[PDB]
Each structure stands twice: as structure tokens, then as C-alpha cells.
Design a protein around this ligand. Sequence first.
Ligand SMILES: C[S@@+](CC[C@H](N)C(=O)[O-])C[C@H]1O[C@@H](n2cnc3c(N)ncnc32)[C@H](O)[C@@H]1O
Ligand SMILES: C[S@@+](CC[C@H](N)C(=O)[O-])C[C@H]1O[C@@H](n2cnc3c(N)ncnc32)[C@H](O)[C@@H]1O
Ligand SMILES: C[S@@+](CC[C@H](N)C(=O)[O-])C[C@H]1O[C@@H](n2cnc3c(N)ncnc32)[C@H](O)[C@@H]1O
Ligand SMILES: C[S@@+](CC[C@H](N)C(=O)[O-])C[C@H]1O[C@@H](n2cnc3c(N)ncnc32)[C@H](O)[C@@H]1O
Lengths: 255, 255, 255, 255
Amino acid sequence: MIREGDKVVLVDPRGKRYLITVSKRDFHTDLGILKLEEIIGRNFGEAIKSHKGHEFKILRPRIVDYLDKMKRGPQIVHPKDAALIVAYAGISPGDFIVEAGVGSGALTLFLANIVGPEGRVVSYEIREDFAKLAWENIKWAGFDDRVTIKLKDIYEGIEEENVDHVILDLPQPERVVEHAAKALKPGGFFVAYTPCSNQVMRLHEKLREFKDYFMKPRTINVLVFDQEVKKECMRPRTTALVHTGYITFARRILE
Amino acid sequence: MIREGDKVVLVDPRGKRYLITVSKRDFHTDLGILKLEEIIGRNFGEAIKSHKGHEFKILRPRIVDYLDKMKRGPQIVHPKDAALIVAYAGISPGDFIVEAGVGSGALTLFLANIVGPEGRVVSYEIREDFAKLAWENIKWAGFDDRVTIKLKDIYEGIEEENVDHVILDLPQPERVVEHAAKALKPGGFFVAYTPCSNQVMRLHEKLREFKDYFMKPRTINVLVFDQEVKKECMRPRTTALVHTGYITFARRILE
Amino acid sequence: MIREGDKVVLVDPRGKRYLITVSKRDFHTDLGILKLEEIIGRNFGEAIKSHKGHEFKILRPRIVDYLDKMKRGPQIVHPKDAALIVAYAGISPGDFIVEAGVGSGALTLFLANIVGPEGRVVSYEIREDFAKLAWENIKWAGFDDRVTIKLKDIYEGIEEENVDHVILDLPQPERVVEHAAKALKPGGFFVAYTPCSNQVMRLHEKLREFKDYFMKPRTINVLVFDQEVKKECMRPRTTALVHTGYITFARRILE
Amino acid sequence: MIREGDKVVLVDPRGKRYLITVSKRDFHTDLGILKLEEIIGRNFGEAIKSHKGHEFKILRPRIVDYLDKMKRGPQIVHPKDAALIVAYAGISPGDFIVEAGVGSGALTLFLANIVGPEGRVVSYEIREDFAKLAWENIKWAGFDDRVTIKLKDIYEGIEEENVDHVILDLPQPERVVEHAAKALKPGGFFVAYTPCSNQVMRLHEKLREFKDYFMKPRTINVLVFDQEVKKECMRPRTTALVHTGYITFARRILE
Ligand SMILES: C[S@@+](CC[C@H](N)C(=O)[O-])C[C@H]1O[C@@H](n2cnc3c(N)ncnc32)[C@H](O)[C@@H]1O
Ligand SMILES: C[S@@+](CC[C@H](N)C(=O)[O-])C[C@H]1O[C@@H](n2cnc3c(N)ncnc32)[C@H](O)[C@@H]1O
Ligand SMILES: C[S@@+](CC[C@H](N)C(=O)[O-])C[C@H]1O[C@@H](n2cnc3c(N)ncnc32)[C@H](O)[C@@H]1O
Ligand SMILES: C[S@@+](CC[C@H](N)C(=O)[O-])C[C@H]1O[C@@H](n2cnc3c(N)ncnc32)[C@H](O)[C@@H]1O
């Protein structure tokens, strides 16, 4: 059963989610006031009603809830891009990742979830304000067990050794190629997300310089179309998010 | 160090990978004969040469190697689609998944890797020939610790209870909606991959019938463009894989 | 030189266009009042200023100006789709086209421009209110020389014979296939625009029935991405119009 | 009726087209020998049979036939891109176009068709071998009435004045911006097709330099998806042509 201090997701009659901590306080919504105390001693799958009689269904928070409801500061990496980073670099339970910059911690949360409680993520960040926001998100999602933030400029070096992956979302990933070459295990991946084609060009210039340290690099971009499926009309949604950034992969190989 | 019986990835001078078991035998390539015995007692990152003097670099097999080099029978789910299944359903270490049909086991391998050694995948399959091929792939990748195959028609029922996700790649996923509703935990996901728009239509008809058992369903399709980045010319690759199948998600919610 | 009663395009300092008729009246803008009389006796390429001193440059109206500035009622066919209709059916100066329904006349204007003053477009329309709006657009663009509107339900028949193309944007183009087969010249095109995949399915069912009257049909959909090209960053625009409708072509062939 | 020396399209039972000149000779196909003399005195829509009894249906050649069946040398501009050039620049019957380089004449044929017999295209070309091939295509399609080829390097200047459009497919369109500014009518379009993002960047650098000569430039790229529509399965075709080149438009405006 659910206890005071536990987190839950409440789903309103419109399907909207609220990720809350269970306490003895009132929670205000546009559908009325909820007495959060009523959740104590209930089980997931049950429901409570607001003072206006609207039902809120109780679910266990999942990674999708934390990602969707986290506090956002610097531009987050979209789940579609995190998905392809994890898929094409083969990111796996138990991996050791160096990430930079932590930003809001959205990519950090996604990677931390995948690596599991015995994996490790060390995220570099130069902006101490952003690092504080990210750390609040990380603690909130319960991933302070496996994530550390370093307030260090990663262009100056990577301290960690025998790293499975170096995953980058910062302006000049070319400034990290040499450090990543040193830090990565044989067969580990360097991955960089970059909004601009200019950045892809600069990164590939640096990867060509370091050609004997990596397998052939690959750059992709991912588009996800939503479909509208009504009884009498299936068609793609009219508008889509067609660009976030390019993703470049290079697998480390010795000599 | 590497021992006889261990698996390794050998990378040839063109960057081509071979996923092999280390034994005392000759391994024939288009670049000459390798004495696999020479790998015994070496460490990852080292290399051996063929009888023609071509170097093969030694790497630890990762999930990407098993997925790329597995034996294929029935049409596999592409990594881009597996990536979005895992991302948008929040598939996580420790999850319990019911999958059908196992097919070649490509999606099974991807999901098994994500759920980790304490997660579980039960994959249903009606074709015993396909089930045998998939099981060989699963044992080969070392995931027989966490995957079971059931030779059962899933349209007749799901035996498992309190399942995190029901993940489908078969012709008529609408025939599984009612069973999945029963099997899924509150907040668990039903996910179905379907090549044809006709199938999406039939599935949504069934999900509308079961509207009080799920949150609003979402159907997507994912396109991944490769970029060609040469010193004097960056452009998308001329041709792309633009369609594999649609992916439909519906999260279980009670009443 | 420009005379009273002529149409001109005025381009403001932000690049915004106004398509106006030259008269002796004041024209109000957010950048001040223009004395349209000042345009009489000027030549294209010259400019006038508003009472606030903002310059408006004078250009000859082109088809792009009429299409961009026309009055819109029923949903117009987007220029990208009209472009592919004209390209893949080979629509040419001098052609005779039957169109339905006229709608706002956007597609009509595009086709009328391509066929030129010796071509002909007969556009069918059942809604007399829409037909009036379209006819105002057609007269405004000066294409009443080559376009006729028929207030007739095209599902009941096409009166015209030896037609180069039958071009459709209405809900049930399958109801026009038999009539188009009769009306079209050998080698002429039947073309239908349809937002929904369901409509494409119904249309292809009818085209299969009429397989001995047409070459193999082809259905496409067209996506146009805008690129943002700043000095330090080139990337696709973040959001795009990814779906308007499918376009189906079938070329008439006898027996 | 058809006369000796006329061109016709013959359509075989598989739907394949042959664009031929009618003479008294044998024409060999994989479906047998045709006696082209049998076409003399027939009308479009009729048919002839090969010596093996396979029927070939007779159609009047249209622009789509000439474009599809022309001789190709240097890489042609794809019809989808020509379509958007014509649509977004508003290319119209009677226009005067300067094009470079002529290449194989594919874009030339498309533009010549649109401008009609009273329009004019002057195409520049430095390779005399390519110019000869293009001119053969142009004469073959009957557009030598309205197209001229100049064996001149367009980077050295445009001789023509009061041009409606300058349309470019060559490596360094930035070298033509100043000449086009001089040659174009007020409101005329400069349009350039460029495969590489690097070229788009260089072109926009030059257009920024010439900002007071043009309206804000726009760069697009066009993707056309084919749909497979079978009775029991509609889906996009698996593979598509996703990249040919970017198209940049800038409309001329004085001062
Ligand atoms: C786009 S944000 C990262 C967003 C993050 N991927 C997420 O999903 O929330 C880029 C981050 O990189 C940080 N950064 C930039 N240069 C850095 C450097 N040299 N070392 C460490 N962090 C850096 C910035 O301060 C910023 O927080
Ligand atoms: C497209 S294959 C699955 C491919 C798989 N996702 C992969 O990545 O390798 C579809 C599989 O579903 C199996 N199948 C079809 N209907 C089924 C049913 N009712 N119960 C169990 N398996 C079924 C087929 O025999 C086949 O192996
Ligand atoms: C989507 S609007 C056409 C928009 C038009 N293509 C444009 O670009 O402005 C569809 C039009 O078809 C007309 N229509 C529907 N059924 C028709 C019929 N059977 N005969 C003639 N017009 C019809 C409708 O009244 C409407 O004006
Ligand atoms: C890609 S091809 C043009 C293909 C053409 N658009 C078609 O559809 O067939 C480029 C052409 O530009 C010509 N060219 C390159 N530089 C030129 C220049 N400065 N002046 C004239 N022609 C030039 C080349 O010789 C070549 O024939």
C-alpha cells in the first residue's frame, strides 16, 4: 500500500497526469481540491475524488512520468533523440557513462534509468545554477543513487577511465574528442547531439583527425510522425516536430 | 583476459565486424585465415593478424553486435522502432514483459537487454520452427537467463499476471487487447507494431471498444535519416528507409 | 506606366505584400496612410511613402501574389500539392481541364495560370455560396477569360468531351472515375487529392474495378521542409506542415 | 490521323512506354517486332500488335513522356524539384527565363513547356558536349522554337535584360547573384538548386551581401513519398528518394 512521503501519479478524467508527493495537505486543481491524505493506505489502481466529485486515478510513477513532469531550464533532449542514442550506442544496464552538459537533467534521467542502480552516470556542468536545477530533478526521480554532477568544464579533460560511453549535448563536442578517446573502453561510444549542420561539419573534421581512434562515424536525425486515427479518417497529424538536432556516433577502436 | 569459449567481436581493417566464439580452430575470411587460438589470453583492445597479415582488432561483444549479427528468419523489428517502443513506454530494468510473436528474437534481444538479468520476458510463438531459431539467438546472446518462449497462440489468452508491458508484432493485435487489459498492471503499456494502415484502423476500433480500460492511444511512425558528411559536402543520404511499421501505445488504467 | 484601375503589389519595409487596385483613395496600413493616386503614372520598381514616411515598393502582380492574397473559404489546395499535380500529370499551356469542386478557387487559379489564355478550365461546384466566392477570386486574378464554373453535381456526370485532365478535390472521387473515363482523351490524366488514407483506399478499389480504362495508378504525398540559414547555424525549421493530402494519378488508356 | 514523321507513345501490355518516330521500319522490343508503318493513318487511342501478338496502344506524346524518355548525361533535376521551382517562383506562360547550366536539358524541357511557345528560355552552358546532348533533347521535344543555348560561362555575365527569372543548377550560384540582380525585372525570381548544405551556406552569405536587392530568401527541400495501396494493405513504399538538393528563392526588389 501507499504511504505518506511516497510519490504517485494522479490521472484526471481528461487523462492529464499530476506527479505528486503524498502528504496530509490539500492539492488544488482546475477540477477541485484533492485531500492527498486519502491516498495513504490505498493501492495503485484505486482512485480518489476532488471536492467537486471528479475522479483521479492513482498510478505508480514510471520513468515516462518523471521525464514528462520534470522542471525544465536549459533546452532538454527530446525522448525520440534519447531513444536513438540508447539504441544505436547499445546503452545497457550496468554501463558507466560520462555526460556533458547536465542541463536540466532530461537526458541524464533517461540514461540513468537505462543503466539501472548498478550503472553510473557522471554528468559535467559549468553553470552552477543549471546544475542545481538538474540535481533537484535527479533527486526527485530517485536517481541520486547512480548519478554524480561535476562542476567542471569538460573541454579541460575527462577524469574518469574505462568509460562505456561519452554522451554530449554542448556547443563544441569536437573539443571533447581527444578526451573521450582517452577515457573510453575499447568498443565504447562517443555520441554527440548537435542542432546545427555547422556543428556536425566541425565535429566530423575533428573525427577525421582522430580517424585511427574510432570506427567510421555515423550521423543521423530522427523524425517521429503522429497519426490521427478517427473512425472515418486516418491521416498523419498536420504538423510535426521535424527537427531537434543531429546525433553523431563514433565507436572507439585502438590503433 | 579472454578464455576459450568466450565470445569476441573481431573488427577487420575495413571496419567489418565478426562475432565469433574463441576456440582452437581456423576462421576463414576474405582477408585470410585467422588462428582463433591466438585470442586466448589476450585482452580486449588488442589485435591478431590473418595469414595474409591483415589486422583484426578484438572488442567485447555488446548488444549492438548481437543485434547486428543474429540469424534472421521472420522479418525483424528494426532498431529504430524498438528504440521508440522502449522510450515511449518507459521500458526499464526489472520490468516483466509479455511479447508476441517471438519471430527471429530481434525485438526479444533488444527488450531482454533493457530489462536486465532481474527483468523477465515471456515471448509467445505459434511457429515452432521460428521459436527454435529465436531460442538459438537468445542463448547465443546469453539472455536465456531472463527470456522464456511459450509455444502458445496468444489470441487464446495471456497466462501471466501483473505484467509491466504487453509488446506485440503479429498480424491481429486487436485480438490481444482484452487479454492485455486483464494481464497488465495499472499504468502498464500495451504496444503494437503494425506495417499497414489497415491494421492501425482495426486496432483503434478495438481500443475504442476498450476505451475505459486505457488512456488515449497514440500511434507513431519513426523515420531515421542518415547524413553524408564529407569535407566539402554535407547532405542527407540520397535514399532512406522511410517505412517499416506504425507503433501504437495505450497505457492501462482501471475503470 | 501604371494607370488608374490597374492592380499592383506594394511591398512594405518588412517585406509584407499588399495587392491593391490603383484608385484615388487613401489606403490604411499599420505603417501609415498611402495615397494610392501617387501610383498613377509611375513604373514598376518605383516606390511611394506613407504619411509616416515608410517606403512601399511597387511590383507587378504575379500568380504568386494572387494565390497568396486571395479570399479563402473552403480549405484550399496548398501550392506544394498543386505543383505536383501539374508536374506529374504534365499539365501544359492549352490544356482543357475539368475540375471539381471549385471551393475557394485556389487550385483553379493555379491551373488557370498554367493552361494560359488559350487553355480552358471548367470547374464544377454544388455550393452556390462557395461558387460565388471562387468566381470573385477568378475575376480578381483576371482568369474569367478561360475559367467557367458549372453549378452541377459532378457525381451525376461530366458534360465535357475530349478533356485533357480531370482534377478532383472533393470527398468521394471514386464517384467520378466512370465519368472521367468517358470524358478523358486517350492519355489524359485523372487526378484526385484526398486528405484521408480511407479515401485513398476507396479510390483504389474503384480504380481496380476500372483497371482496363487506366494505366497503373500512383499515389503520392509531398512534404516541403523549410531550412533556416543563419550565418552561424543552418538547420531545418523546427516545425513543418507534414500532411495535407494524398494525390492519386491514373492515366487514361483505351481497352 | 497520324502521319509518317510524327512522334507517338506506344504503351505495351505491361504499361511500359516507348516514344518513337513513325516511319516505315521495324521496331524491336522484348515482346516482338512492330511494323511502325501500321501506325500511319491511325488515330490516337488505337493499337497495333507485334509479330508475337502483343498489343501496343498509341498515345500522343506529352511533356511527361519527353521528360521520362530523354537522353540523360549530366545529372538531371528531378521533376519534384522542377515542380516546386515553377510553383514557388510562379513561372508562367510567356515568361523570359535565363537558365544555367543546360546540362542534359531536363529542367530546360520542363521550363520550356511551362512558358509556352511565346515564352523564352536562354540556357547557358560551358561544356560543348553537354550542350550538344541537351540541344538534341530540346529539338526532339519540339522546343527549339523557344529555347536558345549560349556557350558562355554565366559567371562572367548575363547578357539578357528584363528577365522574369534566373534559374540555376551549377556549382557556385553565388557567382551569379550580382548578374541576376542586374538582369531581373523588379519582382522577378532568382532560384538556385544545390545538392549540398555547404552550397546553401555560401549562397546565403552572398544573398546577405545583396540584401537590398532582394526580398528575404527562402530555402526548401522537397520529399515525395509513394504509397503502396493493395486491397488489404495501404502503407508508404519502404524506400524513398529523400534527398536531391535544396532550392533557394529570392525575389528581386529595387533599393
Ligand atoms: C542544451 S544543455 C543540455 C541539456 C540536456 N541534454 C538535457 O536533456 O536536459 C547544454 C548544457 O551544456 C553545458 N555546457 C556547455 N559547455 C560545457 C562545458 N564545456 N562543460 C560542461 N558543461 C558545459 C551548458 O551549461 C548547458 O547546461
Ligand atoms: C513479424 S514476426 C515477429 C518478429 C519479431 N518482432 C522480431 O523482431 O524478430 C511475427 C511473429 O508472430 C508469430 N505469431 C503470429 N500470430 C501469433 C499468435 N497468435 N500467437 C503467437 N505468435 C504469433 C508469427 O509466427 C511470427 O513469428
Ligand atoms: C476542399 S473544397 C475544394 C478546394 C479547392 N481545391 C481550392 O483549392 O480552393 C471541396 C469542394 O468540392 C465541392 N463539392 C463536393 N462535392 C461535390 C460534387 N459532387 N460536385 C461538385 N462540387 C462538389 C464542395 O462544395 C467544396 O467547395
Ligand atoms: C547538374 S548540371 C545541370 C542539369 C540540368 N539542370 C538538367 O536538368 O539536365 C550542371 C551544368 O552546369 C554547367 N555549368 C557549370 N558551371 C557553369 C558556368 N559557369 N556557366 C555555364 N554552365 C555551367 C555544367 O557544365 C553542367 O552541364
